Ligand code: NA
Ligand code: NA
Ligand code: NA
């Protein structure tokens with residue numbers, strides 16, 4: 001399987017500052033079988049060059065724990081009139097202190113088009129946000145993961 | 151553990167046509183252990199009068215199947231600078247053709263505030279949508295669910 005092309009297009013690349021960006025719901029499953037969520041952005045999600053896998057850099061401690069337990073995840077991505085629902089299986093990972101760089105294979109993709117414009121969850125990037133989230137460190141871990149995968 | 155008042159305020163009431171509304175991610179878990187999602191709105195979510203429980207009307211067949219198997223769910227709600235994450239346990243249900251009216255107790259509420267404005271997933275209602283989704287049918291099912299809950 002592969003990362004759907006419409007989704008690779010929404011996730012590829014890394015945001016500039018002072019621009020609205022989509023916040024993507026990144027879903028996991030907790031110890032009690034309840035759905036769990038965290039919001040990620042293009043800074044933390046990146047398709048492989050061959051688009052076969054989706055890379056993620058996850059800081060959230062509870063999300064990391066869930067991935068390490070079940071290896072299952074999901075993603076919600078909005079574009080135009082379509083709500084994309086992805087199901088993901090973690091096939092590999094690399095830990096760096098409080099960060100988990102993950103490789104995911106897509107297990108399912110549902111395109112839910114209600115035929116009406118949908119606005120994604122949105123936030124504005126900033127220099128302070130780039131500083132608080134340590135954007136350069138995330139970018140380095142991505143390079144290490146891509147090298148290992150390639 | 152009642153419905154948090156902040157969450158009740160975001161879900162209370164039913165939209166008219168031609169208004170911009172939040173689409174809330176309603177989360178379940180599939181048989182393979184993968185998170186599953188459907189988008190709901192204030193048309194399909196409503197707090198009880200005592201704010202003790204959250205009512206929902208769910209059409210999505212796969213979401214309904216997951217609820218029947220686990221009785222567990224989640225909700226994402228965005229407001230201001232906060233992303234609210236709810237975990238939900240189904241304590242009651244009433245089925246009708248293609249529709250599941252559910253009663254949920256909130257078992258956890260997390261507020262993820264990164265301190266920057268966040269806008270919710272948004273869509274505009276319309277007469278076209280109310281026709282496609284059969285809003286009167288959903289409203290009728292809510293009334294029956296509420297009657298049951300209150301007659302308890
Ligand atoms: Na976040
Ligand atoms: Na990216
Ligand atoms: Na929907």
Ligand code: NA
Nearest residue numbers: 161163192195
């Ligand atoms: Na409502």
